[PDB]
Design a protein around this ligand. Structure first.
Ligand code: G4P
Ligand code: MG
Length: 362
């Protein structure tokens, strides 16, 4: 039941990397595409934070079909981090790790050596080092507490912190550890940087992105295989900045004529292997909304993601498969074909489910 990383309602992503790799440029490109801050009346959105809708053909279709009063797509929350003070980074679920694989041509800087692998080793080392500093401080705190308290939980926390210190000093990320559920629950309270899952974004000039080729990609791929097997997505920051500034008509003409497409949709939809998510929808005249929950969630746990009271008071879940609704075309048709189902406490929610939850007010 415990897993590394405490996913709640949507992913929070930190953009990390060395200076001058295009982090703030990527962030500004995503800001142009973002949900305005007025749509979150319960939240204060910091200046280096953007909320961007996850594009989903299913979500668009449901909104055409139900014509709801309000449309709430799934979204991603993205934070631009300036350098590697650490409150911003500790809070995120996962990391977009941006690598420089772009080089200038006729006008160049002296000794401006591009080496993505060298940069990978530098930043991954720096995250583990910040974890070693954090774990060092917590070991001191626990040892001081253990002078005063007899409590068994302190002896457990200490044994774990020392196992983690040794793992990190051996150059290994916490997320590649074999942690028992008891350890995972303690690790999750620490929010260690090397415990967070990663997507690698490889920043290329627009020619290399259009060509679908770069000399550094095989070297990056090889390193990533020996250090976790995480997703790699090539992009061009300069191309995405230009494309986001064009009008829809100009953008389409540019992409047709030059034979390339935006990487941003793929980047926004990719998510993380360690954080295995599915979408379910609520749909009606008032609202169509996309909900994000852990794969293999049971119906009452999906209700809990709306609010704990709907889980605790759960009675049943009336479910349509998105496929069933799409092919029959409307809810009356789905009911007539007997594909509108009453599901119970043991039902395992499926990606694309359209759910009408029933609960007891007390
Ligand atoms: N060639 C190239 N350089 C990049 C790219 N992305 C970033 N840079 C370089 O790094 C500078 C900072 O860009 P940011 O996007 O703020 O980088 P950062 O947040 O990762 O530190 C840019 O300065 P700038 O003032 O925006 O540009 P410039 O006028 O100084 O060259 C530019 O020199 C890219 O995709 N291609
Ligand atoms: Mg920056």
């Amino acid at each position: 039941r415990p897993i590394l990383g405490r996913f709640s309602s949507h992913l929070k992503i930190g953009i990390v990397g060395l200076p001058n790799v295009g982090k703030s440029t990527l962030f500004n490109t995503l800001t142009k595409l973002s949900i305005p801050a007025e749509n979150f009346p319960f939240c204060t959105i910091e200046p280096n934070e953007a909320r961007v809708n996850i594009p989903d053909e299913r979500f668009d279709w449901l909104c055409q079909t139900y014509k709801p009063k309000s449309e709430i797509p799934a979204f991603l929350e993205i934070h631009d981090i300036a350098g590697l003070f650490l409150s911003h980074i500790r809070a995120v679920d996962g990391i977009f790790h941006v690598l420089r694989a772009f080089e200038d041509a006729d006008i160049i800087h002296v000794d401006d050596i591009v080496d993505p692998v060298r940069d990978l080793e530098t930043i991954t080392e720096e995250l583990r080092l910040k974890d070693i500093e954090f774990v060092g401080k917590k070991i001191d705190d626990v040892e001081k507490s253990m002078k005063r308290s007899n409590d068994k939980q302190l002896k457990i926390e200490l044994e774990l912190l020392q196992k983690v210190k040794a793992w990190l000093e051996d150059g290994k990320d916490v997320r590649f550890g074999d942690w028992k559920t008891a350890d995972i629950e303690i690790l999750n309270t620490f929010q260690l940087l090397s415990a967070k899952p990663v997507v690698y974004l490889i920043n290329l000039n627009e020619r290399d992105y259009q060509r679908k080729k770069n000399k550094f990609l095989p070297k990056i791929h090889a390193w990533v295989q020996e250090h976790g097997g995480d997703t790699m997505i090539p992009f061009s920051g300069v191309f995405e900045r230009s494309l986001a500034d064009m009008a829809p008509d100009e953008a389409a003409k540019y992409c047709e004529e030059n034979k390339l497409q935006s990487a941003l949709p793929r980047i926004i939809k990719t998510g993380f292997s360690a954080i295995n998510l599915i979408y379910f929808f609520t749909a009606g005249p008032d609202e169509v909304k996309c909900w994000q929950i852990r794969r293999q969630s049971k119906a009452p746990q999906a209700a809990g993601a709306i609010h704990t009271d709907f889980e605790r008071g759960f009675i049943c879940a009336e479910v349509m498969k998105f496929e069933d609704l799409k092919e029959l075309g409307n809810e009356p048709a789905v009911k007539a074909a007997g594909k509108y189902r009453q599901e119970g406490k043991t039902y395992v929610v499926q990606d694309g489910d359209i759910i009408f939850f029933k609960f007891n007010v007390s």
